[PDB]
Amino acid sequence: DVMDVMNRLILAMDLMNRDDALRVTGEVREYIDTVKIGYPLVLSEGMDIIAEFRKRFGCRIIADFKVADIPETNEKICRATFKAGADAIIVHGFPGADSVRACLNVAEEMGREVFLLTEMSHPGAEMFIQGAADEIARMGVDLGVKNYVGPSTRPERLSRLREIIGQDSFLISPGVGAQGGDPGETLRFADAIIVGRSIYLADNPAAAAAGIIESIKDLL
Amino acid sequence: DVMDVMNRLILAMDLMNRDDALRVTGEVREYIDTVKIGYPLVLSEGMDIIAEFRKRFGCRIIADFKVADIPETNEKICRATFKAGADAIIVHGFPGADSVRACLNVAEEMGREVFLLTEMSHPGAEMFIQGAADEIARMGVDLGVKNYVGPSTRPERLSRLREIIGQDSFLISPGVGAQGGDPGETLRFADAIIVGRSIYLADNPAAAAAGIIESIKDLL
Numbered sequence: 001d002v003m004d005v006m007n008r009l010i011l012a013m014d015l016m017n018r019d020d021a022l023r024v025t026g027e028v029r030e031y032i033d034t035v036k037i038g039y040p041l042v043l044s045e046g047m048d049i050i051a052e053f054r055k056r057f058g059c060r061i062i063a064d065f066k067v068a069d070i071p072e073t074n075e076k077i078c079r080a081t082f083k084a085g086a087d088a089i090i091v092h093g094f095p096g097a098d099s100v101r102a103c104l105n106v107a108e109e110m111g112r113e114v115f116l117l118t119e120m121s122h123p124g125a126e127m128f129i130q131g132a133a134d135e136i137a138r139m140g141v142d143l144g145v146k147n148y149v150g151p152s153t154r155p156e157r158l159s160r161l162r163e164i165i166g167q168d169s170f171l172i173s174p175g176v177g178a179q180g181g182d183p184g185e186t187l188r189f190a191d192a193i194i195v196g197r198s199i200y201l202a203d204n205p206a207a208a209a210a211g212i213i214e215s216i217k218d219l220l
Numbered sequence: 221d222v223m224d225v226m227n228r229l230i231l232a233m234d235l236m237n238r239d240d241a242l243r244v245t246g247e248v249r250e251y252i253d254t255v256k257i258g259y260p261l262v263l264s265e266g267m268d269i270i271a272e273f274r275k276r277f278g279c280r281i282i283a284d285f286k287v288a289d290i291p292e293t294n295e296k297i298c299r300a301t302f303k304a305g306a307d308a309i310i311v312h313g314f315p316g317a318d319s320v321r322a323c324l325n326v327a328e329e330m331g332r333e334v335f336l337l338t339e340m341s342h343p344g345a346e347m348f349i350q351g352a353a354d355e356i357a358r359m360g361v362d363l364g365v366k367n368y369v370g371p372s373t374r375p376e377r378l379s380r381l382r383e384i385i386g387q388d389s390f391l392i393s394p395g396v397g398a399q400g401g402d403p404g405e406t407l408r409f410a411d412a413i414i415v416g417r418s419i420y421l422a423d424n425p426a427a428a429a430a431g432i433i434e435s436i437k438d439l440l
């Protein structure tokens with residue numbers, strides 16, 4: 001009972017121009033039915049971009065908003081985001097359980113899903129997030145979180161996060177390609193990989209996506 | 221050399237419809253010249269609301285976006301935010317130094333300021349953020365950050381943050397009113413207080429703002 005991500009591949013659409021974002025997403029549509037839309041695109045083009053993607057493509061939308069406020073503000077952010085048509089939203093765990101619970105409550109009420117971001121993929125994540133991440137994950141499990149995000153760039157950490165959340169939980173993982181993570185190795189632990197620049201900056205994004213999929217063909 | 225906030229009072233405009241947000245801000249305009257605009261309003265009404273506030277009120281705009289992504293994405297968020305006319309942006313320190321530096325770089329390029337959020341005001345902040353907060357503040361100092369955010373709801377923690385950053389740094393503080401923080405006590409340590417619901421949900425927002433100011437009149 002998890003979202004059925006085509007080819008285990010989620011596009012991180014972080015182009016900031018509507019025309020370019022629409023073109024590239026359209027070009028890879030035969031390979032990907034799940035698109036992660038974040039603030040680079042939303043702050044450049046408006047929340048109506050979610051509407052436009054739904055209209056143009058047959059794609060699920062994950063709003064990567066890394067929600068990280070107090071409970072009252074988190075509730076408002078989630079409400080606005082789901083109102084706009086996002087299927088799911090990504091929330092930070094480091095602000096604590098009440099902040100996460102606020103998002104879960106709105107998602108339950110509105111019939112949508114929360115993804116909990118545990119450890120991040122960039123070097124700075126080692127300073128504070130890494131040391132909290134196992135506990136953030138355990139907190140997620142205690143709160144009944146079913147969907148998680150963890151880092152492709154640290155296979156040992158991604159493996160531990162998978163252990164904590166169990167095989168039944170859904171885990172997606174960014175940092176593949178540009179940040180150095182390997183698609184096949186990441187899919188040992190994650191249900192789906194998130195890929196941005198490797199696809200959207202390619203001369204031929206469709207060929208780039210098809211190439212990633214070919215490399216993981218035996219894992220589909 | 222620091223931001224000059226009228227009446228040491230920053231309005232947290234978290235109403236989610238344009239008409240109400242503009243009306244209430246108009247009602248209190250004689251008391252403030254600095255407005256914090258966050259995702260509740262921006263995700264509901266669009267980034268164009270920032271220019272509209274500048275057109276109507278001439279106020280400074282702090283974009284409270286809790287920026288908490290990897291460096292590459294942080295750059296794009298800051299660029300989109302400053303393009304919309306924000307004077308400053310609030311950035312989480314928890315994701316580490318590289319993520320903060322990404323924001324500082326864009327702010328310098330566009331003539332804007334970064335505010336570093338150290339400890340948060342809500343109960344969940346105790347789980348992970350609080351234990352990292354002094355180190356996050358020292359990181360800010362090392363990075364040359366001059367503007368900080370810390371919690372009205374824990375004056376002893378707010379005082380410690382002031383100690384770390386020094387008297388020359390600029391410190392603003394939310395959690396006043398609704399979350400239990402006291403305006404005058406908070407201004408012992410913060411340069412300015414952030415106030416949302418105690419004003420914008422009041423029967424008479426102007427009288428609410430006037431009342432807060434009366435209570436701190438000997439601190440102005």
Ligand SMILES: O=c1cc(O)n([C@@H]2O[C@H](COP(=O)(O)O)[C@@H](O)[C@H]2O)c(=O)[nH]1
Nearest residue numbers: 012120121174175178195196197290293
């Ligand atoms: O830990 C994380 C969490 C993320 O959401 N992301 C997001 O995943 C995407 C990665 O894109 P890319 O493949 O271009 O590196 C970006 O949208 C980024 O904001 C990440 O890189 N690391």
Ligand SMILES: O=c1cc(O)n([C@@H]2O[C@H](COP(=O)(O)O)[C@@H](O)[C@H]2O)c(=O)[nH]1
Nearest residue numbers: 070073232340341394395398415416417
């Ligand atoms: O630690 C923090 C950091 C914040 O930015 N905030 C923000 O400050 C505002 C507080 O508003 P209020 O006065 O209604 O509690 C909200 O916009 C909230 O998102 C906070 O409450 N605590």
Ligand SMILES: [Cl-]
Nearest residue numbers: 070071072073
């Ligand atoms: Cl709250």
Ligand SMILES: [Cl-]
Nearest residue numbers: 124316317318
């Ligand atoms: Cl770093």
Ligand SMILES: [Cl-]
Nearest residue numbers: 096097098344
């Ligand atoms: Cl909590």
Ligand SMILES: [Mg+2]
Nearest residue numbers: 404435436437
């Ligand atoms: Mg007083």
